[PDB]
Structures are given as structure tokens and as C-alpha cells.
């Protein structure tokens, strides 16, 4: 998920701006639900996740809000020491303790079968895994265990808030790990990394499970005042694409998302390349991020630098350099011909895949079932970047000479395959676009409807977008919430006219007006 908030001094109009882009996948019926809520002193328009009694992406009379997933460290795994004589007992604070046991019955559609399973809890939480060979059970502690309803209440209070103080109070009560973003009609912006973050033992390495014997327990939760947060930061804006809140904020086992190479660079690049901005500028930045080949930011310069050293003797390398330099780093289809516009992007994709394999297969190949998702992560490839650029690493993966040989061998192999299958001219390399549908199964991993078969180009983009300007009169702007508002399909097969009537807007970078004033709502 991505977000941007723009303060008064960075906005062309002098009004604070907000952009939302939650990434919750693409399903029909959609993951979001758009609504307008109007009662005395409470007027709010926007969307929330399906089933939520509150808006997460939108604006009330006073403020606009959005959120992105925080990735903060709110889950710890405890390594319980089991009694060798009784595997339902674990050692805790000097004594064997009994696990709480629970029998659960599942009715399964075939007639129907009934199957029983037993689940266990310890003082730390549910037991998730056994290492019986080691006399260990692993239990899971969530910092927000039992406080999910307080998080709902905090979000409702954010809806009812009228100013920074009230919004911040709501933020301080939210217990799960999100980033919250705020913009108001007075020109203020604010950012909060919300959640209840535990005070951990300083004797353990928080990238690994914690021994469960009692010496290493959490000692409460830190004050909200210690959560990363800023009101009206000096830079005049905040952007986020699930990246790190601030320099010294840590997240334990999940640091793999917060490295030097990070996808938020697309938003930073776009905001820093401009002076004052408006909503149209924000949309251009979203477009770039949505179609960017993310490895280009750090890896295309490295590739060009290497090829340029050998272009005198290799004419193919000189051609590649020219094509790479003129490429705008996107995989886009502006002429809607079904092929990505830059043929060299197909070369670059295959170059990267070859380079990543050659960097790590000979060392991490044997653990790649666990490490490929780290070293080729969707948010960035920091370790690969450090190895190829010669920056300091703890292990000496490759010398600079060995890294350059990898870059060259990967180039040769990718070019040889394109020459064999397509030809020598880059226009012949242009790859067919990848498409996506709004299907029947969301991230919750169970079916919730029948989906849609309408194909649109894949985009690295929010499942909805709002663009909001907090004008003196009221929030104004535009948004899209695909596939459509209404999920109902009649018994006879007749589709609601609002089942997928926002797909064309989404696919074509068009939007519908943000409605707030009742006179506008009535004519909309």
C-alpha cells in the first residue's frame, strides 16, 4: 500500500493534499466498501475494508485519512521447553505448567463429515508448531491479543475526530501495526506509526524465537509517545510504500522489507523532481510507481556502467547501453497494443533474473526455499545491490571482479536468448502485457463470490485510490473503487449494473468525483 500527504507549502493551491492506495488485491465483489455517512456533526465519505463499520480511505468535514500496513514488530514466537515426560507441559517461571487444551469440531462438505482436532495454548498464546525431536513447542504472542475491538473503537474515533488532537488520541489507542496519515483544512499534515509495541528483553536477538521459560518476557508496552510520528514535518510532505518509519525504528525478524533498495524510491523520486504539486502530479507519481520496473533505480545504472567498459569491443553492448539509457524504466502500454512499449524492458527483466540466480545460487541455492523471497523481494533487493556495487557486507559474497563477470554473463545469456527467439532489434523483444482479473478469492484465502473474467493490465497499484484536496469549503477530489459497488448476482444470473462498472475507470486512469456536499450527492 502507498500513501502521500502534502502540506500547505508543498501544495500549489496552499491546501493540504492526501493520496490513498491500499494494496489488498483485486477481487469481485471488491475488498473495499464505499459509503457516505451523515449525522449531526459527523459527515464522512470514503471506503473501508468490507465489513468494517468505519471509513479508512476518505475524508470527514475536517480531515482526510488513509493507512498503509506498518510491518512493525507485533508478533513474537516463544520457544517453549517441554517436559520430556509429558509433552503437554512446559517449563515457565520455575515450574512445569499445563497447556490449556481445546477440542474443536469441523463439519466438512463431501454427505457431511465431522472431524475433530485438538489445539493448545500456553501463557504466551496458541501453540503454532512442534519440534518434538527437540522437546520444543512454539507459541505465538500478538501484542494486540484481546485488543482488536479497542482497535475498532480507535478507528471509529478517528472517523469522529475533528482536529489533530482528537485524531492523535485515536491513533494512540489503536493496537495493531499500521501507518496512519492525516491532512486537514487548516493545512496541517500528520503521520503516525500506530500500534502497541512491546518492551522486550535486551538479552535476546529479536530476529529469532524467544525462550519461553520466563526470563525473557515482555515488560509491558511502550508509550505511544515513543512510536514514530510527526506533525507538519519540515520536508513538507510524507510518502510511504510500506517502508521504514524513521532511521532507528526496528522491526526484528521482518527487517527484509526495510533496506537501502526500497520501492518507496519511486514516490520519493517523483515528489523530489517537482516543486509545488497538485492532485494531477500525485496521479502521475502513482502511474510511475504502478508501472515501474523497480530494479531499475539502483540496478540499471550498475548494468550500464559495466557495459560501457566493454562497448568498444562489443557492439551489442553499445546498443544495449543506448536502449537502456533512453528507456523510462516503465513496463507500460501507452498505445494499448497489448505489448509493453520498451523492448529493452524484456532484456532487463531477463538480465535481472539471471543476475540474481548467479549471485546467490552457489551459496544460498540450498536454502533458497527460504531465502529467495528475501533476496528477490518485491520491495527491493538490497543485498544484491550491495554485492554488485561493492558496498560493505558482513559476508564477502563476491569480489568486484566476480560481480562484474556475473553482470556480463547475465547480459550475454539474456541477449543470446532474445536473438534466438525474437531478433536483434529491441522493438522485436517487446513482451506481451501481463493481465489480471478481479477474481473470487482474496488474501483471506477463501472464496467469497464468483469473481469477474474481465482482463485488465497488471498494475503495482492500490486496490482503490483517493485524491483529496482539503479546500477551505470542504474536501474535494476524485477516486475509484473497482470493480464496482454492488456484489449481488440474482438467482437467474443477472448481474447488478454496479458489479463492475468502475473497471474501465480503473484500467484507463480515470476517476469519479469525490462527493461531500449533499447538493452534489443528489445529482451524482
Amino acid at each position: 500500500s502507498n500513501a502521500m500527504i502534502i502540506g500547505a507549502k508543498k501544495s500549489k493551491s496552499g491546501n493540504a493534499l492526501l493520496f490513498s492506495g491500499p494494496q489488498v488485491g483485486f477481487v469481485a465483489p471488491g475488498f473495499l466498501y464505499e459509503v457516505g455517512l451523515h449525522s449531526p456533526g459527523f459527515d464522512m465519505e470514503g471506503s473501508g475494508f468490507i465489513g468494517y463499520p468505519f471509513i479508512m480511505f476518505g475524508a470527514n468535514q475536517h480531515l482526510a485519512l488513509t493507512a498503509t500496513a506498518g510491518y512493525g514488530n507485533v508478533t513474537d514466537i516463544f520457544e517453549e521447553k517441554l517436559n520430556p515426560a509429558n509433552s503437554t507441559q512446559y517449563f515457565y517461571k520455575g515450574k512445569w505448567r499445563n497447556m490449556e487444551k481445546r477440542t474443536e469440531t469441523f463439519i466438512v462438505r463431501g454427505k457431511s463429515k465431522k472431524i475433530e482436532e485438538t489445539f493448545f495454548h500456553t501463557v504466551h498464546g496458541p501453540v503454532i508448531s512442534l519440534d518434538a525431536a527437540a522437546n520444543v513447542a512454539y507459541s505465538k504472542s500478538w501484542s494486540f491479543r484481546g485488543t482488536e475491538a479497542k482497535s475498532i473503537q480507535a478507528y471509529m474515533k478517528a472517523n469522529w475526530a475533528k482536529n489533530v488532537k482528537e485524531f492523535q488520541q485515536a491513533a494512540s489507542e489503536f493496537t495493531m501495526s499500521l501507518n496512519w496519515y492525516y491532512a486537514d483544512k487548516k493545512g496541517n499534515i500528520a503521520y503516525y506509526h500506530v500500534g502497541k509495541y512491546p518492551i522486550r528483553s535486551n538479552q535476546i536477538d529479536d530476529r529469532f524465537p524467544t525462550p519461553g521459560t520466563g526470563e525473557y518476557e515482555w515488560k509491558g508496552f511502550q508509550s505511544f509517545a515513543k512510536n514514530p510520528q510527526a506533525i507538519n514535518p519540515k520536508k513538507g510532505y510524507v510518502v510511504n510504500w510500506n517502508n521504514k518509519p524513521s532511521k532507528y525504528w526496528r522491526n526484528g525478524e521482518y527487517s527484509i522489507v526495510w533496506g537501502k533498495d526500497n520501492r518507496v524510491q519511486q514516490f520519493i523520486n517523483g515528489i523530489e523532481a517537482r516543486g509545488k504539486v497538485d492532485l494531477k502530479d500525485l496521479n502521475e507519481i502513482n502511474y510511475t510507481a504502478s508501472f515501474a520496473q523497480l530494479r531499475t533505480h539502483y540496478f540499471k545504472p550498475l548494468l550500464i556502467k559495466t557495459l560501457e567498459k566493454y562497448q568498444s569491443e562489443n557492439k551489442e553492448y553499445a546498443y544495449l547501453v543506448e536502449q537502456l539509457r533512453k528507456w523510462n524504466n516503465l513496463k507500460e502500454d501507452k498505445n494499448h497494443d497489448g505489448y509493453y512499449d520498451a523492448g529493452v524492458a524484456a532484456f532487463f527483466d531477463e538480465w535481472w533474473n539471471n543476475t540474481h540466480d548467479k549471485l546467490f545460487n552457489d551459496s544460498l541455492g540450498i536454502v533458497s526455499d527460504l531465502t529467495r523471497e528475501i533476496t528477490d523481494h518485491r520491495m527491493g533487493a538490497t543485498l544484491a545491490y550491495k554485492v554488485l556495487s561493492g558496498e560493505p557486507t558482513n559476508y564477502q559474497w563476491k569480489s568486484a571482479a566476480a560481480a562484474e563477470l556475473i553482470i556480463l554473463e547475465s547480459t550475454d545469456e539474456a541477449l543470446a536468448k532474445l536473438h534466438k527467439e525474437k531478433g536483434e532489434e529491441a522493438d522485436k523483444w517487446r513482451a506481451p502485457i501481463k493481465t489480471m482479473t478481479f477474481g473470487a478469492k482474496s488474501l483471506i484465502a477463501i472464496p467469497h463470490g464468483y469473481g469477474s473474467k474481465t482482463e485488465i493490465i497488471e498494475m503495482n497499484r492500490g486496490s482503490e485510490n483517493h485524491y483529496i484536496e482539503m479546500t477551505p469549503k470542504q474536501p474535494e477530489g476524485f477516486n475509484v473503487t473497482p470493480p464496482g459497488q454492488i456484489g449481488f448476482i440474482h438467482k437467474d444470473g443477472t448481474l447488478s449494473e454496479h458489479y463492475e462498472d468502475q473497471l474501465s475507470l480503473y484500467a484507463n486512469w480515470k476517476f469519479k468525483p469525490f462527493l461531500f456536499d449533499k447538493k452534489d450527492v443528489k445529482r451524482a
Binding site: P29, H38, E45, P209, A445
Partner: protein, 195 residues
């Protein structure tokens, strides 16, 4: 425009409902009602996801998923205890929201051929009524996904598998490059002086 009870509901040209109420209790009931009008089967299935009852509808392919959901989830009584710890008014509004969903359920089962969507007919089952605890279940099924992970266990396995092939000193260095303590050059949303 239509007045459902004492709330005026204006559906715009994209079908989005805009609710005009005299108080929050009426507003939140209407909110649950319109969401059920539009999305009842989806709501039912999201709730079954949290309760671990998907396999009742979709069969044995979802048994292990239902087991995970029940293993890590909460009983109705535990959720009710959470609701009882909220501010009085907030609990009451969540109850109103559930009453609105239930109002549509009750209307739909009276006219199932017109008001129950095709999935219920095709899969041969009916929606049940809703309580406030079920609303909390709808929040948990999706929000917890973004918070819950077992990467600590994967990390332990990476280190152990590296150690047994490469030895401890090399494995530690490799692991520190894979899962770092803090990359001081990672781009950040704010600066420390902004705190």
C-alpha cells in the same frame, strides 16, 4: 432516494449509498443494512473464514485453513468480553451495525428467490443472523493478516541450515546480510528531528 426506517439513503449513479440520519444509532444500523444489501454473501464468507467454517460450504480443500483460523482465533465469549470493554456508546453502535446486517438477512429469507444472491442458491445454504461479535470477526479476518507472521521460525531454520553446511562463523555473517538488525540507509517516511 429512499427512506429506510428514519434514514434517507441516496444511491448515486455508481450505486454508492449516502446515508442521512438524525443520530448515530440510526446511521450505523443503516450502514450495516446497505452493506448487506450489496455484499451479503461476501460478508457471510468472510465471517466463515474467521470462524473456521468455510469447509462446510467448499469442502475438504479448506479444512487446514479452517484449522489455522480456529487455532489462532477467539471464542464468542472472548469477543464479547472485548466488546464489553469498549465505551458504552461504541459497543452500542457496533450492535446497531450488526442489527442492520440482520435486518437485511431477515428481509432476504422472506423473499429468498429475489433477495438472496446466486451463490447462496447454487451452494445450497442460507445466511445466518448477525451479532456484534460477528462484526469483530469481520475486522479480525482481514486486519490480522497484515500483522501475523512466523518469520522468526523461518529465520531460525535459515541459520540452522547455513550453520550445518558452512559452520557457525560464516553462517552468522551470511544471516546478518539476509536479515539485518538495522539498515541505516533504508529510505524513511520521516526524519528523527521530525519526531
Amino acid at each position: 432516494q429512499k427512506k429506510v426506517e428514519n434514514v434517507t439513503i441516496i444511491r448515486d449513479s455508481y450505486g454508492v449509498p449516502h446515508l442521512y440520519a438524525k443520530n448515530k444509532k440510526d446511521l450505523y444500523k443503516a450502514y450495516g443494512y446497505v452493506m448487506a444489501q450489496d455484499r451479503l454473501f461476501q460478508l457471510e464468507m468472510f465471517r466463515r473464514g474467521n470462524e473456521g467454517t468455510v469447509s462446510e460450504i467448499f469442502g475438504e480443500e479448506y479444512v487446514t485453513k479452517d484449522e489455522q483460523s480456529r487455532r489462532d482465533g477467539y471464542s464468542d465469549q472472548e469477543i464479547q468480553t472485548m466488546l464489553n470493554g469498549l465505551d458504552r456508546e461504541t459497543k452500542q453502535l457496533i450492535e446497531q451495525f450488526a442489527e442492520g446486517i440482520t435486518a437485511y438477512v431477515n428481509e432476504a429469507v422472506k423473499a429468498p428467490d429475489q433477495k438472496l444472491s446466486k451463490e447462496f442458491h447454487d451452494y445450497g445454504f442460507l445466511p445466518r443472523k448477525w451479532k456484534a461479535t460477528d462484526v469483530v470477526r469481520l475486522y479480525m479476518v482481514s486486519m490480522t493478516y497484515f500483522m501475523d507472521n512466523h518469520q522468526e521460525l523461518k529465520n531460525a531454520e535459515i541459520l540452522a541450515r547455513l550453520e550445518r553446511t558452512y559452520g557457525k562463523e560464516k553462517a552468522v555473517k551470511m544471516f546478518d546480510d539476509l536479515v539485518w538488525k538495522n539498515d541505516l540507509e533504508a529510505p524513511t517516511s520521516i526524519q528523527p528531528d521530525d519526531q
